[PDB]
Design a protein around this ligand. Structure first.
Ligand SMILES: *[C@@H]1O[C@H](CO)[C@@H](O[C@@H]2O[C@H](CO)[C@@H](O[C@@H]3O[C@H](CO)[C@@H](O)[C@H](O)[C@@H]3O)[C@H](O)[C@H]2NC(C)=O)[C@H](O)[C@H]1NC(C)=O
Ligand SMILES: *[C@@H]1O[C@H](CO)[C@@H](O[C@@H]2O[C@H](CO)[C@@H](O[C@@H]3O[C@H](CO)[C@@H](O)[C@H](O)[C@@H]3O)[C@H](O)[C@H]2NC(C)=O)[C@H](O)[C@H]1NC(C)=O
Ligand SMILES: *[C@@H]1O[C@H](CO)[C@@H](O[C@@H]2O[C@H](CO)[C@@H](O)[C@H](O)[C@H]2NC(C)=O)[C@H](O)[C@H]1NC(C)=O
Ligand SMILES: *[C@@H]1O[C@H](CO)[C@@H](O[C@@H]2O[C@H](CO)[C@@H](O)[C@H](O)[C@H]2NC(C)=O)[C@H](O)[C@H]1NC(C)=O
Ligand SMILES: *[C@@H]1O[C@H](CO)[C@@H](O[C@@H]2O[C@H](CO)[C@@H](O)[C@H](O)[C@H]2NC(C)=O)[C@H](O)[C@H]1NC(C)=O
Ligand SMILES: *[C@@H]1O[C@H](CO)[C@@H](O[C@@H]2O[C@H](CO)[C@@H](O)[C@H](O)[C@H]2NC(C)=O)[C@H](O)[C@H]1NC(C)=O
Ligand SMILES: *[C@@H]1O[C@H](CO)[C@@H](O[C@@H]2O[C@H](CO)[C@@H](O)[C@H](O)[C@H]2NC(C)=O)[C@H](O)[C@H]1NC(C)=O
Ligand SMILES: *[C@@H]1O[C@H](CO)[C@@H](O[C@@H]2O[C@H](CO)[C@@H](O)[C@H](O)[C@H]2NC(C)=O)[C@H](O)[C@H]1NC(C)=O
Ligand SMILES: *[C@@H]1O[C@H](CO)[C@@H](O[C@@H]2O[C@H](CO)[C@@H](O)[C@H](O)[C@H]2NC(C)=O)[C@H](O)[C@H]1NC(C)=O
Ligand SMILES: *[C@@H]1O[C@H](CO)[C@@H](O)[C@H](O)[C@H]1NC(C)=O
Ligand SMILES: *[C@@H]1O[C@H](CO)[C@@H](O)[C@H](O)[C@H]1NC(C)=O
Ligand SMILES: *[C@@H]1O[C@H](CO)[C@@H](O)[C@H](O)[C@H]1NC(C)=O
Lengths: 724, 724
């Protein structure tokens, strides 16, 4: 029987399908099929061809994306897509009028447009061009320029800078339409005094001279960009200047962040602010006073969230989900025991009321109606690495009803959901630990309407392959239960002793051990090279309580490192793991941990790989770093900024085999970091291996580069484990 | 018996001494001994302490170097040394009076001084600070400012830019005093429109953001800097200005280089100009007029040098060696048979007379007397790799007497000399093949006056070691003699079979197969690991004829590559070479040839190492590249610029093991060149090994890095050669 070879991983020979849809109603969604865009109605099961693939290639050129207007009158076509960063880009957009079924030729959308978003209702447009905000009341209507200070690397209106897109918003967008489309809320960023990172780009062999790329990148303690929030009335845009909503006073004592903007009603806006010392968060509720007319942000509806053991939220404070009347909201907060649970806020009330509790966390709030609230939790079977859909009755909080627990309990233990408007229907997505699945459900009776994708083709293709097995198990460290996972080789024999390879992230609020089904590189090693690939969620991990999560606070590189070693020591006690063939590798925080582990002097690991590793917290951006480590000042936390460098551990690298990989175009984890490591390894008489990948970004993902780094790492591990 | 250990190379426990001296008279020379500067009198032989080691330490700073005035009244002390580039720096200077045993504190020399030069007679000073020339007729005097348009990276007066420093002048100085100290000639460079290479420098772990380093670097085809030559009357300057000496019309038809400036008499100057297409140079003899025009350059005394087969000279045209009257000069030129020989030029007459001939070349003219001319050639036994001192009676060209050939014909075959003023005495300098030896001679009888350094302790300390033996042999390629060297392991047994390591430079006018004595890394591989290390000098090599050397013209990366292969194949046919264990490595042109050899698909070499290689001549500087490859224009030589890249040979790297090393702060061979290779090797799916060295220049020389790179390369060889 065939095995999962390396070519099977790198060539995507074994494709896993999914089912991605866009709810455009309370009962209709769009789905792309055979390059056609089909419009499905879940209330009747009937579906029409909404957008022929004929009218996708008959424009002049290849179209990259689409976005249909909420009134289904116009379609945006995106083409000439040029990648900027993780979530950012610039492209040209066309407008396709569906009433005439004709392409719009006048009042077009300029080339090099950065952002674009429809209004929630109707057909109004807002786009960002040369870092300025423009609005179009109609595709057949001239643009209205809102801002005029758009300066590259200085001022951005409506689009995020680098740190916000990466570490806060997780999207390039800084436009927020009002539900009626009357108001637009946009953010203005100012990176004028933010220091710049500079790295060279060695483009095609034609380029005689390299390019120098500049990016405003505040490192730990550096000058941070400012943000201001302005609101604009689209219906009477030529009456007043954009109205700034000043941040609350609580956050104005120094530098601060803007982390979320949500619309409660057609005339009420909510702003989540965050201090720079990220243990203080506040929600401001602002109503439109049509008199002056200003935005009236009453103090009595300010809502504070703090943390005594560290920072607020998991990565950033939870976003509020307002009720249909915008006079209350539900947001996730840590209870007294330190577990993320759902709390009920009244806009005018100073306290919140918890509606869920237990020794388990709530992952997120998925949908909200007047009678039920839908959410995801890791409560089922007390397994933190699982995800299941629940619903809460808003009259009797004791009446919690899991919607995914008993559907296929052996095959599916990791669910997610995508709801429609008003939570009439919801798409269920199972991710593991067996073959994924996608189904359509109706919230009225929670019955499966139809099976969207079963991956049956995947199922039979794996039947002919000696696939490895994934075990979800746990262990105890100083009396605390800690979960881990093992990818076991096929025909696993506990009497025989296998080599061990540890996959690390160990990042704050990370979770590497979970009931998810992946066709990864580890799948190759176990199925073919018969290597046990493990991952251990120790201290600093998430979804297990603020006790375990905040243990790493202000002490990065201390406990998440020891516990990877200590768990590795536990694995040796088992009778099926070779003591002399234990390895480790990571990526962008594992590479930090993997490096910091090999420098611990543990005599546990034989070799290691660090891919785009962090080497010192002095080098990473302030938003992620200062959240867990604070400021590098002698008065705040400068001590452990220095005590936690990989370079301080060079001498102990004489005992292991180090392989260091890093891409040169890395805008996230700068090549400066790996360079500082090698200088410490060189200056210490330590021999090691290295490999750069030219013009590859942080997540090395170019087809040629993705295949090369893993084919390189396979040779390394096989040489370290003395494998064929 | 012990062997030459790797630690013996990297730690230099087994030191080799040398005798370095500064002739300050016709019979006196300065010599440093235990940090004391001693004055020696060659005539009788006695000695006296000229400068105590109390100094260099009694002043508040460690003194790097010293320089004594010709009239022996003042001494310069160099401190605050900050290395700029290869031959450049910037440092601070203190002036010390000898008649008063005092340190001058009035009218001091500024810090951050970029150059300093004494007049050849008297004690006139000339230093360059902020790219402007300042002059002092006496150390106790103010500094008259000559130029005022100095600007960083834009204009340089008196100091070279990068390309002139590296590829023409081999010095940072662009000052030329007249013999009487009356005139000062200085050149002015303009890099205003020359593109700037940029690379990042990752300083100490405490240095948060990296520093971008800009350097005016004209790559092949780019805009070269302009150069103008001015002369100043130092005696009466407050009245007069500098006087420009315009280049000949022969050279003003385009871009041109200034390659030499020599003072014939107190009022006569010789300028060597060079066309950008380096097959046309001219010497200009310019006389001083007591009225305007300040400098009268007669047309009838222009002297022009051309080459129809390639470029002019070896690296640059030979410099002229004037007679005492300045009415004639000897210089090295190619004859009709293509052999560099000495020619006698007469200023006014347009032809020259060869005073030497034969199928061998002259290396350099060492000294000129009114009766004899001393020079260095490779005539003895027809060995190009040997150097000996000869002398010609300037009356009887037939009386050509060797002064070193038959001293120790078994120990010494690679001589050089450092003559005194007027050539009364000359230090003989033997460099191999056996242990070096330094002796002092008298010109009147060529009789050894005394033995300066015999390296006796080095002789004894070597007999404790199984030291290798180096053979200088030759082979015929297509009926053309080609020489090679073989470092042979001790106790050589031609019945056995040895691994083969081919050290490659193979650059134009290069010589890797000589009769010199080096304690190198090749010694370790032969003494300890029993590896034969060979070096072959094929087509493109110098000192053998312009037929052999200019065969590389406009065809770089073609013939010097193939010849290395076939010589290795001829090494394969030998009975003592393991065909399956042949490897090759090189540095900075060898890395180019090594990479180009491994890409040829010859199945000859098993593995290879390329350290700081050239990947594409499009990326190297113009002065070097255009000299041998022409212009990368579709009309001149664009094609073999394209055809000669390493990246075009990526596929054939699947058959060899490849290790690529490069310094991140390399300004000579930019990191871009290595990065372009890996991208082609990544795009071809070829696995290889790489290793960067942060902030290491082209000649990776940091004490820590130098050990790490040779240690890293040894592991690669042993693994490739299947050794312990
Ligand atoms: C974007 O940010 C930059 C810098 O973060 C802002 O410009 C800077 O504004 C400050 C004051 O806010 C200026 O500093 C000093 O102001 C005092 C006032 O007494 C004055 O006396 C000093 O001479 C000095 O100017 C600073 O000069 C200025 N820097 C600039 C203009 O480069 C800028 O206003 C921000 N823009 C937006 C749209 O947010
Ligand atoms: C150092 O080199 C720079 C760049 O070559 C010199 O400045 C440049 O001079 C040229 C003229 O040779 C200017 O080009 C154009 O000339 C035409 C002639 O009609 C004129 O119409 C244009 O308006 C322009 O002047 C060029 O602008 C100028 N570039 C600058 C000043 O940045 C410079 O003179 C050289 N310096 C020395 C000391 O030799
Ligand atoms: C969208 O909502 C806004 C605010 O609710 C509407 O604006 C107000 O509309 C009311 C009546 O609905 C008027 O009495 C006010 O004079 C309006 N004030 C402002 C500032 O607009 C807006 O008309 C609504 N638009 C649509 C298309 O529903
Ligand atoms: C948020 O964290 C900061 C520092 O991490 C806390 O600042 C402390 O403030 C008190 C004043 O009440 C000082 O006495 C301490 O010295 C401060 N600590 C440091 C390390 O500077 C702040 O109290 C925290 N906020 C909350 C609400 O817990
Ligand atoms: C959807 O795919 C699953 C596989 O994940 C199918 O379930 C298997 O069906 C076979 C029948 O031959 C049983 O023997 C297996 O035990 C089942 N496995 C699991 C994990 O349930 C299922 O039949 C497919 N459904 C459809 C409609 O095709
Ligand atoms: C060492 O060489 C020096 C060279 O300067 C000799 O210098 C002598 O200096 C005295 C001083 O009055 C003169 O009178 C002599 O004429 C110099 N000698 C010569 C040869 O010129 C010095 O003599 C030498 N050493 C000794 C011990 O005499
Ligand atoms: C150095 O040489 C220069 C030129 O050879 C001398 O300058 C000339 O000196 C003579 C007589 O002293 C004058 O008639 C000329 O007018 C001078 N010409 C110039 C250009 O200066 C100079 O005097 C000599 N100085 C020394 C110290 O030897
Ligand atoms: C110096 O080199 C150039 C370039 O190789 C030579 O220019 C050639 O000249 C001949 C005759 O004028 C032309 O037919 C060629 O087309 C020229 N080649 C180029 C590339 O322009 C020039 O002749 C050489 N100089 C000497 C003295 O031989
Ligand atoms: C100078 O050094 C050379 C070699 O470095 C010495 O020459 C050797 O001398 C020994 C006698 O002890 C002979 O056995 C060797 O055959 C000699 N070798 C050569 C190449 O000649 C020489 O003795 C040293 N001279 C002094 C004065 O120390
Ligand atoms: C376009 O859609 C039709 C609908 O069946 C399908 O047959 C055809 O293959 C599609 N073409 C492309 C290029 O996707
Ligand atoms: C489904 O049927 C209803 C009623 O028959 C119709 O109004 C609707 O348009 C149909 N769906 C589509 C996508 O046309
Ligand atoms: C200085 O010179 C004296 C005289 O020979 C010598 O004894 C001493 O060791 C020297 N000191 C240094 C530091 O070179």
């Amino acid at each position: 029987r065939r095995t999962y070879t390396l070519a099977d991983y790198l060539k995507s020979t074994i494709r896993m399908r999914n089912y991605n849809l866009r709810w455009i109603s309370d009962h209709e969604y769009l789905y792309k099929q055979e390059n056609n865009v089909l419009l499905f109605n879940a209330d009747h099961g009937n579906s029409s061809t909404f957008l022929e693939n004929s009218t996708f290639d008959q424009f002049g050129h290849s179209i990259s994306d689409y976005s249909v207007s909420p009134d289904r009158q116009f379609v945006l076509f995106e083409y000439n897509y040029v990648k900027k960063w993780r979530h950012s880009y610039t492209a040209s957009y066309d407008i396709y009028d569906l009433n005439k079924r004709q392409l719009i030729t006048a009042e077009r959308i300029p080339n090099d447009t950065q952002l674009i978003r429809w209004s929630p209702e109707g057909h109004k447009l807002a786009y960002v061009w040369n870092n300025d905000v423009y609005v179009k009341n109609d595709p057949y209507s001239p643009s209205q320029r809102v801002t005029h200070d758009g300066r590259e690397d200085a001022i951005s209106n409506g689009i995020t800078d680098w740190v916000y897109e990466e570490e806060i918003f997780s999207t390039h967008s800084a436009l927020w339409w009002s539900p009626n489309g009357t108001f637009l809320a946009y953010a203005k960023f100012n990176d004028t005094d933010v220091p710049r990172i500079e790295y060279s780009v060695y483009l095609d062999e034609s380029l005689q001279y390299p390019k120098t790329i500049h990016i405003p990148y505040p490192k730990a303690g550096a000058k941070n960009p400012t943000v201001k929030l302005y609101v604009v009335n689209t219906d009477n845009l030529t009456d007043l200047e954009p109205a700034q909503i000043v941040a609350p006073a609580s956050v104005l004592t120094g530098d601060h962040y803007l982390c979320d903007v949500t619309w409660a009603t057609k005339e009420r806006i909510s702003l989540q602010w965050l201090r720079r010392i990220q243990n203080y968060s506040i929600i401001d509720i602002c109503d439109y006073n049509e008199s002056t007319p200003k935005w009236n942000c009453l103090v009595s509806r300010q809502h504070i969230e703090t943390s005594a053991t560290g920072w607020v939220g998991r990565f950033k404070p939870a976003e509020p989900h307002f009720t249909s009347d915008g006079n209350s909201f539900y947001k996730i907060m840590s209870n007294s025991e330190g577990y993320k649970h759902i709390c009920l806020f009244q806009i005018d009330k100073p306290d919140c009321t918890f509606i869920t509790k237990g020794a388990w966390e709530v992952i997120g709030i998925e949908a909200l109606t007047n009678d039920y609230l839908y959410f995801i939790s890791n409560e089922y079977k007390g397994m933190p690495g699982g995800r299941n859909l629940y619903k809460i009755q808003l009259n009797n909080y004791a009446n919690v009803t899991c919607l995914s627990c008993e559907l296929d309990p052996e095959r599916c233990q990791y669910y997610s959901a995508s709801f429609s408007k008003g939570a009439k229907y919801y798409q269920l997505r199972c991710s593991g630990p067996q073959i994924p699945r996608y189904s359509l459900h109706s919230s009225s009776n929670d019955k499966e309407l139809r099976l969207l994708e079963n991956n049956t083709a995947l199922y039979e293709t794996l039947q002919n392959i000696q696939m490895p097995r994934k075990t979800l198990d746990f262990l105890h460290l100083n009396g605390t239960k800690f979960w881990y996972q093992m990818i076991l080789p096929p025909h696993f024999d506990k009497s025989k002793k296998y080599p061990l390879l540890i996959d690390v992230y160990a990042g704050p609020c990370s979770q590497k051990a979970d009931a998810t089904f992946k066709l990864s590189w580890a799948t190759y090693l176990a199925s073919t090279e018969n290597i046990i690939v493990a991952s251990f969620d120790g201290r600093g991990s998430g979804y297990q309580g603020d006790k375990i999560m905040h243990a790493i606070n202000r002490r990065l590189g201390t406990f998440e490192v020891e516990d990877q070693i200590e768990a590795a020591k536990q694995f040796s006690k088992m009778g099926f793991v070779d003591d002399k063939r234990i390895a480790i590798w990571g990526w962008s925080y594992g590479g930090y941990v993997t490096s910091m582990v090999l420098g611990a002097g543990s005599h546990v690991f034989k070799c290691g790989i660090a891919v785009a590793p962090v080497s010192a917290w002095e080098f990473y951006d302030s938003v992620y770093t200062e959240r867990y480590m604070g400021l590098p000042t002698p008065e705040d936390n400068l001590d452990h900024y220095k005590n936690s460098t990989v370079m301080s551990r060079a001498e102990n690298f004489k005992l292991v085999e180090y392989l260091l990989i890093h891409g040169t175009a890395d805008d996230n984890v700068h090549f400066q970091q790996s360079a500082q490591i090698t200088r410490a390894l060189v200056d210490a008489g330590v021999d090691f291996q290295a490999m750069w990948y030219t013009d590859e970004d942080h997540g090395i993902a170019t087809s040629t580069a993705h295949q090369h780094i893993y084919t390189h790492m396979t040779h390394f591990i096989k040489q370290c484990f003395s494998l064929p």
